[PDB]
Design a binder for this molecule. Sequence first.
Ligand SMILES: *Cc1cc2c(cc1C)nc1c(=O)[nH]c(=O)nc-1n2C[C@H](O)[C@H](O)[C@H](O)COP(=O)(O)O
Ligand SMILES: *Cc1cc2c(cc1C)nc1c(=O)[nH]c(=O)nc-1n2C[C@H](O)[C@H](O)[C@H](O)COP(=O)(O)O
Lengths: 99, 99, 99, 99, 172, 171
Amino acid sequence: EVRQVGEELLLLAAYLLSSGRGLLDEPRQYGTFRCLDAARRVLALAAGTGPHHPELDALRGRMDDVMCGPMGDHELDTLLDQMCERLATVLEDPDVISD
Amino acid sequence: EVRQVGEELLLLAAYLLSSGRGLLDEPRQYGTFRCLDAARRVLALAAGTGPHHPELDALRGRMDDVMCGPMGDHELDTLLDQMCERLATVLEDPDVISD
Amino acid sequence: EVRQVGEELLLLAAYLLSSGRGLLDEPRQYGTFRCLDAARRVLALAAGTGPHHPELDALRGRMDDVMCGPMGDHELDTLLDQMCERLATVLEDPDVISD
Amino acid sequence: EVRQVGEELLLLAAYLLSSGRGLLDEPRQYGTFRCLDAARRVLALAAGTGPHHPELDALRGRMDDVMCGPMGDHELDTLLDQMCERLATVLEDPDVISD
Amino acid sequence: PSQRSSHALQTLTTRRAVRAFADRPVDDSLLDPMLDAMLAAPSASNKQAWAFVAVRERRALRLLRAFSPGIIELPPLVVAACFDRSRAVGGWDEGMLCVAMAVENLLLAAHCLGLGGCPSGSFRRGPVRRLLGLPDHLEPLLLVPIGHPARPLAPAPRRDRNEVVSHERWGT
Amino acid sequence: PSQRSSHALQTLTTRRAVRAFADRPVDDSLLDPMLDAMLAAPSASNKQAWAFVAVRERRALRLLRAFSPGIIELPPLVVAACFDRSRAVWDEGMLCVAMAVENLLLAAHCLGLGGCPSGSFRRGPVRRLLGLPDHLEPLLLVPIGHPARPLAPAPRRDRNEVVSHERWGTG
Ligand SMILES: *Cc1cc2c(cc1C)nc1c(=O)[nH]c(=O)nc-1n2C[C@H](O)[C@H](O)[C@H](O)COP(=O)(O)O
Ligand SMILES: *Cc1cc2c(cc1C)nc1c(=O)[nH]c(=O)nc-1n2C[C@H](O)[C@H](O)[C@H](O)COP(=O)(O)O
């Protein structure tokens, strides 16, 4: 099971590198969008094997709606704030994350 | 060991969200650097759990040298292209990725 | 009536000039195709006001099939020979052309 | 006068067919030359019958110098673009082309 | 379910370029659905960095045909598709391909209603730009002549399927 | 006649990009009509100057997704459209390949599936995975698969801004 997670981590790292190279040609606003895409990918992978928390599933669902859904009419200042704060609150739970 | 991998994945996702939110304030050139930073962080997670390949260690060292330590220079079009290409060679190995 | 023909001649001259500029970028084989395209345009204008001969209409019909119709599987060595010879035979008629 | 214009149109069409057939043997660069040669021939027909515009006479002299003059030392890409642009201005004139 | 899939597949497959138009003008009732379905094409970022000009005046059509060797017969209607460099992504541009995709939707929009045309693109950009009044940032891409067909559709020879498409590799 | 035209126009208009794909695979019997519709697209000079690759293996799909940031979720099928430089007449014919890709998208909607073309990818690694020769240059990756979530239209500008009449600036 650990090996499968590692393989998907390698593919994820390749995606992050490709996004880094791509951002040198993409418009200004994709810096956050690619980070959000990678975040939802990581959360899918982590929900696969890592700690389970209902709010984390809510986070992944919101990211899926943002990305996999219609594009446009999206504000990034506030949306990212709520997403980051919700994830933070989850991580502050002594159970989801380990000291 | 899988549980610990998951908790570190949650931390990485939180870092990705924070980097995305911050990239609006940070200049455009920081998008690629944040992507590359996330790339080396992911490879750090996969170093002790994922497939062990010498070129993976070399690549992680490359990104470590670039992000950590001295700041400046580090032309990114060529650097990112080279790093991503090397990771591409790594991923095609049958042992690295099964299916 | 005479003025209308002249106006169509100016547009025809503009098409010939545009074809000349175009041929510097088009593949090798459009040197004849553009000449054939211009030829049928001239014959269409000439059939409107100039001398009427049944074989001249046959020429214009064959040219229309070649150009307006499907493209490909067309030979130019023989096809252009028969069309040029048929038009030469018509022009040799003392009635179609004036001394 | 309309009948004579038609007869000269038939001769021009025969010249277009003969030029096309020959262009196979002649090099590629002659494709533009034949089109330009046909352009001035067409304007000759329209000189005495079509609309009389001072720029049309100037253009006809331009192609006359290129063709009837010494061969070589001709930059076709710039010459054709400039000439076609000039004829365009002429055709935009409401008097040159009515509809 | 199978019947509509079959019909749409037949409509898409039996789309042949039309170069011999008839003497039937393209009415506005036959154009509004055409432009409506044509605009429903992918855009780079939903930028919609494109511009279209619908030409029907006989004078303008003749002037466009005269300066564009691509057009073979006088078209009742013309659609000039152009790339909007104002909203270009990253600044060849990928959005130009989206302009071409909208032109493909244009061709199918013409086929369904009985019209026809070809994505003509061999034209003098300068004279066409001056004729159609584009500003500096609108770069002409395609000049599709759309009109009522006059010649029966005639299929054209096509390359072997094995030499054009492959399965997850090349040559396999 | 009128009903067939109306149905076709509905099919063309309702075409929406699909970024979420179910874990269902694309059958060959369902892929063949899509390929036929895609190949029935205009070219530069009837030169058929293009190349298509139909990736369906799971490992190849995952590698392409990793090396193509444009792809959002793992697609059951990938169509790699490439320009054929050997048959070429910054290229006019490069637009015809995108036209073929558009036909493929509409074919996906013909069979109820959906495709999301993407041009934001690393040509080098993607070429290496696809095994394309030197002359062929990949230009579009089209993740295609059965939709998993309802599709909604994207915001669109007014028709007056994007479409004019016989001039520029005329409504
Ligand atoms: C033409 C084009 C469309 C793309 C591209 C790139 C090009 C050149 N890249 C995309 C991508 O990376 N991700 C993605 O999700 N879509 C891409 N598209 C499609 C286009 O953005 C959408 O079709 C657009 O949102 C319009 O949607 P629609 O439902 O109205 O067609
Ligand atoms: C894709 C394309 C098609 C063109 C172009 C330009 C492009 C980029 N230019 C054409 C032109 O100038 N004149 C013309 O007559 N056709 C043009 N076409 C269409 C092309 O010729 C057709 O695709 C082909 O002849 C037949 O295709 P088919 O699908 O009908 O068999």
